[PDB]
Amino acid sequence: DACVHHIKRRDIVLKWELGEGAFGKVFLAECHNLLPEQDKMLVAVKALKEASESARQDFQREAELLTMLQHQHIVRFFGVCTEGRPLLMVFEYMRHGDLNRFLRSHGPDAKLLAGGEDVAPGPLGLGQLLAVASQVAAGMVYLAGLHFVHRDLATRNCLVGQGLVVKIGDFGMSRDIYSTDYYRVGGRTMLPIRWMPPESILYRKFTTESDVWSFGVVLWEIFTYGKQPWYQLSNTEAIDCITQGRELERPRACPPEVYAIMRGCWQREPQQRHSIKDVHARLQALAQAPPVYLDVL
Ligand SMILES: CC(C)(C)c1cc(NC(=O)CSc2nnnn2-c2ccc(O)cc2)n(-c2ccccc2)n1
């Protein structure tokens, strides 16, 4: 509560709504006197929907976590606004939205119409995809370092910004645009089953090793340009396939070495999976490698 930075309401000017959840409305806003170099900048502002009693504590833990967890590929948190209501959380605005939307909007069958400023026309090339994957991996190295377990790693939970800087976040399981990416158990609990390893589905254990599995699935989302994992399957069919040891096929756009990295994440025994530090190293080696090398994959 003391560690969390505070922003005066007068310094925040709401412009329009960006999105909406069950836990809050997100707005694009101007924030004044937040930084030295920038006299005025753009921010995402989550206004708390104070309906339930516990939402105020979730707000608090979110703001506390995001004040502690800060890194180049984690969503940037600037502080809260507690003076008056509704309570506001203030974030760095990422102009391309979520990585899933971005991947789909530069998929295959994308002509010269897509592109400009920070991305080329049409389908993202191998270098761009490896760049995306390396950044996410870097963010997961950091969380792995602090022994944080994400539990909902997926492209829909990654933001993309100016110059394709990618940062990991977590936007609840609240937005209805991605409700089919969860399996509703009974009432209110939602499970991202298609991203989950067999030990998480069967035994309900979430660890650093279950995140690496999920990164593996993010790597497949990236190389399928935002395709849902197991899109051909219903939820229960997916649970069956994942628990019975079935693996997602190599995507068309994905070369063998990168599929090898995915398979590294998908070892059935958690112990046998490669560390996120190794995966990042491999991807960044690939991301930064010269054109001559990459053209031969
Ligand atoms: C870092 C970690 C993965 C642990 C994480 C991140 C978050 N939180 C986020 O990622 C909210 S980002 C966000 N929220 N509202 N709007 N918005 C938004 C919209 C568009 C933009 O361009 C920019 C921002 N958590 C977390 C922790 C506890 C409870 C809930 C979430 N954990």
Side-chain angles (χ1 to χ4, degrees), residues 24-250:
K25 301 182 166 175
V26 187
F27 290 89
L28 182 75
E30 309 169 19
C31 201
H32 294 93
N33 303 309
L34 191 63
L35 294 179
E37 190 178 350
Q38 289 197 280
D39 199 55
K40 157 167 165 175
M41 66 183 296
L42 290 166
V43 290
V45 175
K46 185 184 159 294
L48 182 60
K49 192 218 170 189
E50 291 153 294
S52 66
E53 297 187 321
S54 199
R56 177 89 178 209
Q57 293 287 313
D58 299 304
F59 186 104
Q60 274 191 55
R61 63 164 282 264
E62 179 169 16
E64 285 160 28
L65 257 163
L66 282 158
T67 305
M68 291 187 175
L69 304 184
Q70 292 285 73
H71 176 263
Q72 290 184 14
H73 308 274
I74 299 298
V75 172
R76 198 174 169 180
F77 181 55
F78 290 118
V80 310
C81 179
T82 60
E83 59 171 30
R85 287 204 204 189
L87 301 189
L88 318 176
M89 276 184 276
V90 182
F91 291 97
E92 173 190 47
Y93 176 60
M94 302 295 279
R95 81 181 187 77
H96 292 287
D98 79 69
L99 181 60
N100 194 256
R101 211 97 206 82
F102 182 75
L103 286 168
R104 288 179 175 282
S105 77
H106 301 92
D109 67 66
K111 299 183 169 174
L112 294 162
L113 302 173
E117 272 256 343
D118 47 9
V119 63
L124 294 168
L126 179 47
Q128 294 114 104
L129 296 167
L130 288 169
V132 167
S134 174
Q135 292 186 68
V136 173
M140 292 307 288
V141 170
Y142 175 74
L143 291 173
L146 306 170
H147 309 93
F148 192 82
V149 181
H150 196 290
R151 303 165 138 267
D152 200 7
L153 183 58
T155 58
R156 67 177 174 281
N157 284 323
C158 292
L159 298 177
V160 192
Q162 199 166 80
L164 311 192
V165 180
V166 177
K167 308 202 189 189
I168 299 169
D170 184 353
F171 317 123
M173 308 176 291
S174 55
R175 302 162 298 172
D176 288 1
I177 191 170
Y178 302 117
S179 59
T180 68
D181 289 335
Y182 304 80
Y183 177 60
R184 270 202 167 78
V185 290
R188 286 189 167 177
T189 287
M190 272 187 137
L191 296 172
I193 59 174
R194 296 157 193 283
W195 282 264
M196 278 164 62
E199 78 279 356
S200 295
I201 303 182
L202 295 171
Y203 323 134
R204 318 191 186 189
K205 294 183 190 171
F206 291 94
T207 62
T208 296
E209 285 71 25
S210 61
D211 273 348
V212 186
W213 178 287
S214 291
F215 175 83
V217 179
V218 168
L219 190 55
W220 186 96
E221 286 184 271
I222 287 165
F223 278 89
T224 64
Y225 301 91
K227 213 160 280 175
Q228 194 186 56
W230 304 112
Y231 68 92
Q232 67 280 25
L233 305 179
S234 70
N235 288 317
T236 53
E237 289 169 354
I239 292 157
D240 296 334
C241 286
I242 298 156
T243 57
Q244 292 182 49
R246 210 177 156 203
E247 284 195 347
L248 299 160
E249 288 163 295
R250 193 171 60 77

